[PDB]
């Protein structure tokens, strides 16, 4: 397809790392996904008695000192600490040895939807109570979104392309796709790519609550996230990070890397419709998926698994069903599609990264993760949405969808790598 | 070069738009740049007695009603209003007509370094004084960084690739280079690319002041920004936006577009050194410029003009001189390099977009804009830095450099088009 | 020793701040100390063409607006501006959050040797030329010595014990030692203590010049301050400030404070000998150091480093050698003693504060700062005086000595804190 | 109380010395205090037509040759001569014999608020009219505040702790309390402690005048100082000194010393409010008195006499009434409180030492000295302020308050010795 036509340089995944509401690493998170475990709970880290939503997907038991000194960590917003944890895990998982001979060829693209909201909140309190002199000196470099890419490159000595995306739900999906573009173009041999988020502060839960975006099912938080279910009432805000080591194929082979999967395509579109609520036909999402398949040189009939956007929103969920039916026709009923957000909630800038990882693991393990809480599928939601329980099945090709605020769409295509 | 080797699809600039401390459009800004005028003044829009820095580069007399309904505008942070203004100007300037036939082929990549800080500060006040149910419903959609790309795409019906960079000083440079990559790769025929910033709130001036990053020359704000001058004492915080319509060459030719210049190379690197100060030898900046020249298929001797990063910081300015000397050797004495931030201050996420525009206009007008305030060049700062006054000269190739917090580097290469 | 016998409440250092001739903060000053850099230069801030000494240790590039508004600062003598800058730095460095629950427990003891000499000079000029009605209304509250403690308590809301010492060279050493007494006694949990000076006006340089107290080595000001060198010819007048946050140990531990060191003893004596020239045997200084060691429960053999008084005076320097030989016997040859005044000059009321800080940093970094310019040690000056270059070495215990006009002696004892 | 809990070592007063506007020693001053005599008069010792205040509390007929050679004296500012006179009087009164056996155990803590202002003004004149080489060689050593402690230690051979406080009105109170701390802690057995002031020069009367801090009642100087009177218009500047020999009790007992009273508590606080005016509720003063009572192990109902700060200022006087009412509740109407500054004026750095002496003599003689000039008590000034005339009464416990510029507070607690 277009990717292979534009460069002979193929892109594979050789390392993964994650923090999620289900685990402090990939295997612990994935065990929870396959078991249909919810990571959603009442928030403990702050008092939400005055808030309309008092629950979400928190990282439980994170220890930044597994990754950084206490002193290094005090300077850094949680979204940075999370993105470094995922990145360091991914690089360790890859087995790559960074040297003087390769450091220029290794870059970073780690993004965030909202970035350092907690630090911004803490410094505004200092500003209003005591004045600008009590703002932290580390406020800017500890809070701006590109500092995951910055600090990761400083800690590991990575001198390749260095940047950060910020596209809401699509952040992690653009980051990975544009990192694959760098490698195939020849600007890098390796990229650490993905995203991180920690928006569970007063401003984040309050801001999404004021926009009426969030589920308010406080009495049963594990049932709140119910993509395609007729009783859904908005998304669950979740925290964490995902990172993937992307690598040119011959570079991976020459060092005896373990290859999880190949990244064979990347599609994008804009809805040009509305800030939050996509068109009911999912026309934009449909263009994005077709662009991704043409990029990969795949026919729709070759797709086995879709890791949906599936945020548990009235407008969003049904648009995605329509887009899949448009792109896949009869094959819509043969593929499996699931929303892992049923278990993790919506990790916003990290969603696309953690979901790329789940898509790769679906290929490794030949199993479609479930959509939990899909008790009463809404009108039209009659596909195999892997309701309730994991489904073992053949998976050669897995898509990951992200349809983010502003109508910004991205789709990744992963495929088994034979070796 | 590498870009030509990877795709036959050339990328040209067909439209430009801007808000800057020097003007409310490109021509008014550029007239200011060539006259050596300062856009820096004491900040009027808030009170700053408790701050060590009370001046910056403001956008003066912005009228959002030239671009949006007063309705639409009320919901949006100034960085979004600024981004939209530059974007709309660039699309108007391009002469491009969006139709059902091409809308899937036109995308947007508008970034910001810090985004909707004013809105975040105002909503934090509501939260602390009155609780979370008094936060504005418009807070998230009117504040998050990708809403410039989102709102532009909705208003103009653009259905191509849609995303947003956030790379501090490098934002506008990455936004433009990665948009050019999209077009050359084939996933768009047109992109609107650039950045915007309005970080002059208490958190912004306060935050950069707490880091001791800003000039504190309150008595003489127009002399504060003095890149490579021995008495520089940090950067000047500025507001604005820049946007460029990038276009595949056959698509531009087919509609009889006016072509300002060609985008021939884009280079990136990471210092992997320090969170804010570059290495003294500018090794990262040097790698980044070499990568961009190699992308463009240019020998260093083919470069005429460099629009510097040149933020007026002690460590940053001298590293860029070291990097240019490293890359260019004896040719470092033949090219002209200037920092327009001497006049504009540092527009952070918009710096790379307004300076790309300044680079393209240097090619159009065959003139190197000045580095004003360069009274006493520091030790080793002995290049043609176009001190004080614009220099008419031959300019076939113009570079634009951005060396951002975290050591993130980007360079663009523009060339005269035929 | 006596301190531990009189109270179970231990005193630790959790924050430090400084203005000196070597830097506008602690790390910049300390980098200069360890490099053997001189901060002494011809004075620029006034015309000294008619003066016998034209050089000193000035604060270079101070920006009061990093700490106060222009309008607030205009009312305050430079010695006050300097003391507030050091105090605000120390409190920020401590990370302590001042609240309604603790403000009564936080006090201030910031002193000065001479206080508001510049403001007094400017107001005398107004008085003699225009009469008493042109004296500034802020002249008293902007000039009297206790107004560093006053303004610091008003700005930060500190309601604990509030006072000011004035003991010439010993000012900063008494301020810190008596602040530690307050905390151990139970009168405070926290004290901001130290001192500040800006005596470089016509009256200060002229007054010390008339007393023949100052070096007149105008042709080579960086060589003027040469403690224990046979060619010394009096002290160098220097400006600046030092402040330390002293804190009860369990109070520091309970808030997760970073602890630099423990303040384990404080000694005092009077020479009862002479206004300026101590006895040749240093009998007073020797009693003061022994008092400090007995206060700390230390034997002389446990002392590793002494930050000397060492002002570069004929009588003073040799008295301190004698006192160290008397107190330490054979161990006098194993410890290291240095005068940082070789680099900073004599900061008078701030000396004891900046030198306490250097003693604490010698413990943090395990390095003895040099005595620069010690080219030809005088008769008897045969100890390890760390001549020329910093000396990395084991330092568990550091003393700071101040032997001030009137024969007023103080010694602080700092020791590593294990955590 | 806290002091007894922290050390078994009790502190007693065995000697007292004074210069005041009422006399050249303690019993002449005290005779004046008990007769309600004013020490305030037009200043003779300079000319004051250009000043809004031309009167104060001077020391009358001081003969330094009773204490020093005319040689020794010529080198010393009057504040030093005054501090030494009070110190020598206190040591004589104490009966203490300094020997080789005890000299290391006897220290000094004599403070001043402003120090050698007369000398600084005279040397400033030399500097301005004739240049820096006409400044006196005696200027620094005869002017800096710690030279009272320095010269006393040299003259009497005292080798104990040696220091000097400078806390405006609180100077003498801090000097005495912190000297008591030294003794109870064990770092001395004897301290000479107090303060001295001679600020009646052009800079002092001029400086306090420019701040509008002084009474301007030039027609009736003896009526100027009127604490808590509705027609008060600022303080009266006075000169002098006070010193007390503080002594550990077993040390006093062992030499058969005469013990005047015991020092049983010392309290401190900061207002953290304003540079010169206290909060109207006297919250800082209240905290300071409570701390002192808690240090002494006394219930408020055990207090019989308060020697007030009571400087005759609008904000200060009423804050102290509010603080006493807060601390003492219904007992505020049973105790007697007076301001001896009604007679002495404000001795600034010496106020705390002379008033400590007055508190001790109130215990000795069982009499509350008067607040003279208290003709028309202000709104809410309805306590027993001992208006007009001394009041014989039972006094077991006497407080002395000092509430100084910068909001620095100190209270001493004295008790009859049993």
C182 and C285 in a single domain? The answer is no
B219 and B363 in a single domain? The answer is no
Identify the domain boundary among D254, D282, D316. D254
Number of structural domains (chain C) is 2
- Looking at chain C, which residue has its C-alpha nearest residue B48? C69
CA distance A136 to chain C (A): 9
The CA-based diameter of chain C, rounded to the nearest angstrom, is 64
Contact, C397 vs C303, CB < 8 A? yes
Q: Could you say which DSSP state residue B66 is in?
A: G
Would the CB atoms of C6 and D162 count as touching at under 8 Å? no
B402 and B315 in a single domain? The answer is yes
Whether D362 is covered by a domain: the verdict is: yes
Contact, B236 vs B222, CB < 8 A? no
CA distance A133 to chain C (A): 7
Nearest 5°: the CA angle B28, B29, B30 is 95
Contact, D136 vs D218, CB < 8 A? no
Would the CB atoms of A160 and B269 count as touching at under 8 Å? yes
Residues whose CB is less than 8 angstroms from the CB of residue A305 and which lie 6 or more positions away in sequence, other chains included: A335, A336, A337, A338, A359, A362, A363, A368, A393, A395, A397, A398, A399
Whether D259 is covered by a domain: the verdict is: no
Q: How many CB atoms lie within 10 A of CB D379?
A: 8
The residue to which tokens 């000083």 are assigned = B169
The residue to which tokens 């360079």 are assigned = B411
Contact, A268 vs B163, CB < 8 A? yes
Cα separation, A55 vs A216, whole angstroms: 9
Cα separation, A311 vs C378, whole angstroms: 82
Cα separation, D61 vs D45, whole angstroms: 11
The CA R_g of chain C, rounded to the nearest whole Å, is 20
A355 and A215 in a single domain? The answer is no
The CB-based long-range contact list for B250-253 (8 Å cut-off, 24+ gap) reads: B250/B9, B251/B105, B251/B189, B251/B190, B252/B12, B252/B14
C86 and C158 in a single domain? The answer is yes
Beta strands in D22-64 (DSSP E): 40-42, 55-57
* CATH number, domain containing residue D75: 3.40.47.10
Burial class (CB in 10 A: 0-12, 13-18, 19+), D233: middle
- Which among A43, A144, A152, A201 is the top mutation candidate for probing chain B, defined by the most B β-carbons within 10 Å of its own β-carbon? A144
Burial class (CB in 10 A: 0-12, 13-18, 19+), A42: exposed
Contact, A274 vs B154, CB < 8 A? yes
Residue C317 sits in which domain range? 266-415
* Tokens found for residue B249: 């060459």
Q: What is the CA B35 to chain-centroid distance, rounded?
A: 20
Discontinuities in chain D (C→N > 2.5 Å), after residue: none
Could you please report the per-residue DSSP string of D147-177? HHHHHHHHHHT--S-EE-B--GGGHHHHHHH
Q: How many CB atoms lie within 10 A of CB D47?
A: 10
Comparing C-alpha atoms, which of B162, B156, B242 is closest to residue A168? B162
- Give the containing element (helix H, strand E) for B358: helix B351-365
* Tokens found for residue A280: 């009911």
Name every residue in A having a CB less than 8 A away from some CB of C: 133-134
Q: How many CA atoms lie within 13 A of B129 on its CB side?
A: 11
Cα separation, B140 vs B362, whole angstroms: 39
* Tokens found for residue C374: 């010690």
Cα separation, A241 vs A247, whole angstroms: 20
Residues whose CB is less than 8 angstroms from the CB of residue C253 and which lie 6 or more positions away in sequence, other chains included: none
Q: How many CB atoms lie within 10 A of CB C366?
A: 15
The residue to which tokens 């999402």 are assigned = A285
* Tokens found for residue B68: 């949006």
Cα separation, B144 vs A120, whole angstroms: 14
Q: How far is CA C308 from CA C321, C340, C370, C385, C405, in A?
A: 9, 8, 11, 9, 16
The CA-based diameter of chain A, rounded to the nearest angstrom, is 64
According to the 3-state scheme, what is the secondary structure of chain C? CHHHHHCCCCEEEEEEEEEECCECCHHHHHHHHHHCCCCCEECCCCCCCCCCCCEEECCCCCCHHHCCCHHHHHCCCHHHHHHHHHHHHHHHHHCCCCCCCCHHHEEEEEECCCCCHHHHHHHHHHHHHHCHHHCCCCCCCCCCCCHHHHHHHHHHCCCCCEECECCHHHHHHHHHHHHHHHHHHCCCCEEEEEEEECCCCHHHHHHHHHCCCECCCCCCHHHCCCCCECCCCCECEECEEEEEEEEEHHHHHHCCCCCCEEEEEEEEEECCCCCCCCCCCCHHHHHHHHHHHHHHCCCHHHCCEEECCCCCCHHHHHHHHHHHHHHHHHHHHCCEEECCHHHHCECHHHHHHHHHHHHHHHHHHCEECCECCCCCECCCCCCCCCECCCEECCCCEEEEEEEECCCEEEEEEEECCCC
Whether A259 is covered by a domain: the verdict is: no
A30 and A148 in a single domain? The answer is yes
Whether C260 is covered by a domain: the verdict is: no
Could you please report the per-residue DSSP string of A37-78? ----EE--SS--TTSS--EEB---S--GGGTS-HHHHHTS-H
Whether D216 is covered by a domain: the verdict is: yes
Contact, D66 vs D85, CB < 8 A? yes
Chains that touch C (3 or more CB pairs under 8 A): A, B, D
The neighbouring-strand residues paired with B237 are B346
B377 three-class SS? strand
D399 and D283 in a single domain? The answer is yes
CA distance B240 to chain A (A): 19
Comparing C-alpha atoms, which of A99, A360, A154 is closest to residue A242? A360
Residues whose CB is less than 8 angstroms from the CB of residue B374 and which lie 6 or more positions away in sequence, other chains included: B226, B227, B228, B229, B342, B385, B387, B388
Contact, C167 vs C85, CB < 8 A? no
* Tokens found for residue A395: 């998976």
Cα separation, B175 vs D184, whole angstroms: 73
CA distance D391 to chain C (A): 34
Cα separation, C301 vs C347, whole angstroms: 30
Identify the domain boundary among D232, D254, D276. D254
C27 and C114 in a single domain? The answer is yes
* Tokens found for residue B97: 């007509």
Cα separation, D373 vs D389, whole angstroms: 10
Whether B261 is covered by a domain: the verdict is: no
Q: Convert C378-413 to b/e letters by CB count within 10 Å (16 or more is b).
A: beebebbbbbeebbeeebebbbbbbbbbbbbbbbbb
Whether D321 is covered by a domain: the verdict is: yes
Would the CB atoms of B50 and C63 count as touching at under 8 Å? no
The neighbouring-strand residues paired with A111 are A195
Cα separation, C117 vs C140, whole angstroms: 12
A178 three-class SS? helix
Cα separation, D47 vs D62, whole angstroms: 20
Identify the domain boundary among B254, B281, B296. B254
D226 and D276 in a single domain? The answer is no
Cα separation, C262 vs B349, whole angstroms: 47
Residues whose CB is less than 8 angstroms from the CB of residue D395 and which lie 6 or more positions away in sequence, other chains included: D304, D305, D336, D362, D363, D366, D367, D368, D416
The residue to which tokens 């206060």 are assigned = C295
Cα separation, B263 vs B251, whole angstroms: 15
Q: What is the CA B297 to chain-centroid distance, rounded?
A: 24
Q: Could you say which DSSP state residue D225 is in?
A: -
* Tokens found for residue B246: 């990038």
Q: What is the CA A248 to chain-centroid distance, rounded?
A: 22
Beta strands in A116-218 (DSSP E): 162-163, 190-197
The residue to which tokens 């979400």 are assigned = A56
Which of C6, C139, C141 shows the shortest C-beta gap to D185? C6
Return phi, psi of residue B299, to 5°: -70, 145
Residues whose CB is less than 8 angstroms from the CB of residue A323 and which lie 6 or more positions away in sequence, other chains included: A281, A282, A283, A284, A285, A286, A289
Contacting residues of C for A134, CB less than 8 Å apart: 92
The CA-based diameter of chain D, rounded to the nearest angstrom, is 64
The CB-based long-range contact list for C182-186 (8 Å cut-off, 24+ gap) reads: C182/C107, C182/C109, C183/C9, C183/C11, C183/C246, C183/C247, C183/C248, C184/C3, C184/C6, C184/C7, C184/C9, C184/C10, C184/C11, C184/C248, C185/C7, C185/C9, C185/D2, C185/D6, C185/D181, C185/D185, C186/C7, C186/C9, C186/D2, C186/D6
Contact, A110 vs A146, CB < 8 A? no
Q: Could you say which DSSP state residue B149 is in?
A: H
What is the experimental method?
A: X-ray
A231 and A362 in a single domain? The answer is no
Whether D341 is covered by a domain: the verdict is: yes
The CA R_g of chain A, rounded to the nearest whole Å, is 20
C176 and C305 in a single domain? The answer is no
A93 three-class SS? helix
The CA-based diameter of chain B, rounded to the nearest angstrom, is 64
Would the CB atoms of A124 and B203 count as touching at under 8 Å? yes
Which of B50, B212, B216 shows the shortest C-beta gap to C69? B50
Contact, C373 vs C253, CB < 8 A? no
- Give the containing element (helix H, strand E) for A92: helix A78-94
Residues whose CB is less than 8 angstroms from the CB of residue A163 and which lie 6 or more positions away in sequence, other chains included: A108, A109, A146, A149, B165, B167, B170, B174, B178, B268, B408
Cα separation, C41 vs C56, whole angstroms: 6
Contact, A245 vs A192, CB < 8 A? yes
Contact, C241 vs C85, CB < 8 A? yes
Contacting residues of A for B208, CB less than 8 Å apart: 140
Return phi, psi of residue C240, to 5°: 145, -150
Comparing C-alpha atoms, which of D84, D49, D40, D79 is closest to residue D372? D40
Q: How many CB atoms lie within 10 A of CB C207?
A: 30
B231 and B281 in a single domain? The answer is no
Contacting residues of B for C65, CB less than 8 Å apart: 52, 216, 218
Would the CB atoms of D186 and C2 count as touching at under 8 Å? yes
Comparing C-alpha atoms, which of C29, C20, C36 is closest to residue C371? C36
Cα separation, D234 vs D252, whole angstroms: 42
């Amino acid at each position: 397809g277009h990717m292979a036509s534009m460069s002979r340089r193929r892109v594979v995944i050789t390392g993964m790392g994650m923090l999620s509401p289900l685990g402090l690493d990939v295997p612990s998170s994935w065990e929870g996904i396959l078991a249909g475990r919810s990571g959603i709970a009442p928030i403990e880290h702050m008092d939400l008695s005055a808030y309309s939503t008092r629950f979400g997907g928190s990282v439980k038991g994170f220890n930044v000192e597994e990754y950084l000194s206490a002193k290094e960590a005090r300077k850094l917003d949680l979204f940075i600490q999370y993105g470094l944890a995922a990145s360091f895990q991914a690089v360790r998982d890859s087995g790559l040895e960074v040297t003087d001979a390769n450091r220029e060829r290794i870059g970073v693209s780690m993004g965030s939807g909202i970035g350092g909201l907690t630090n911004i909140e803490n410094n505004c309190r200092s500003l209003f109570e005591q004045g600008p002199r009590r703002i932290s000196p580390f406020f800017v470099p500890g809070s701006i979104i590109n500092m995951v890419s910055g600090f990761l490159s400083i800690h590991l000595g990575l001198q390749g392309p260095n940047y950060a995306l910020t596209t809401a739900a699509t952040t992690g999906t653009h980051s990975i796709g544009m990192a694959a573009r760098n490698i195939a173009y020849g600007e890098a041999d390796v990229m650490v790519a993905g995203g991180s988020e920690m928006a569970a502060c007063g401003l984040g839960l309050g801001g999404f609550g004021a926009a009426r975006a969030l589920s308010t099912r406080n009495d049963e938080p594990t049932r709140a996230s119910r993509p395609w279910d007729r009783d859904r009432d908005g998304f669950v805000l979740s925290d964490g990070s995902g990172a993937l080591v992307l690598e040119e194929l011959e570079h991976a082979r020459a060092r005896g890397a373990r290859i999880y999967a190949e990244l064979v395509g990347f599609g994008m579109s804009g809805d040009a419709f509305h800030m939050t609520a996509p068109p009911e036909d999912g026309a934009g999402a449909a263009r994005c998926m077709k662009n991704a398949l043409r990029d990969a040189g795949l026919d729709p009939r070759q797709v086995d698994y879709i890791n949906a956007h599936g945020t548990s929103t009235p407008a969003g969920d049904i648009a995605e069903i329509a887009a899949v039916k448009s792109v896949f026709g009869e094959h819509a009923h043969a593929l499996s599609m699931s929303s892992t957000k049923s278990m993790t909630g919506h990790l916003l800038g990290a969603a696309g990264a953690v979901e790329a990882i789940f898509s790769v693991l679906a290929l490794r393990d030949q199993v479609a993760p479930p959509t939990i809480n899909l008790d009463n599928p809404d009108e039209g939601c009659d596909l195999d949405l892997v309701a309730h329980e994991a489904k073992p099945r053949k998976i050669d090709v897995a898509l990951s969808n992200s349809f983010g605020f502003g109508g910004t769409n991205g789709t990744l295509v992963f495929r088994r790598f034979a070796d």
